Amino acid sequence: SRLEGWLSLPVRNNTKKFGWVKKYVIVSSKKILFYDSEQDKEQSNPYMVLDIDKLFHVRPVTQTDVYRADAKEIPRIFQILYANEGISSAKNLLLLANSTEEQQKWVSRLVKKIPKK
What we know:
The protein is an alpha+beta fold.
């Protein structure tokens, strides 16, 4: 197996605000997969997929990343930058970890898998 589990992503529960939602994220060898449930995974229905090699840099977030969030959640949330169109446009992905340790593993593992570390 490899880096996999449930990470929280900013979801619009109201309309403009963005809370969290545990989605099944699984970083495959030199690849990143995103799912919403096991039923979708077994059916080969990847909600999202990113290229590890495309990643520019993976590092933890800070209080500046979110305001409504919690100072305790900040250290449990990491950000992953990846090229979407070119370079400067490269977007990022915010993922919250139920435990700080998870953020250290997810980031360290997913980043370690990156070729341009």
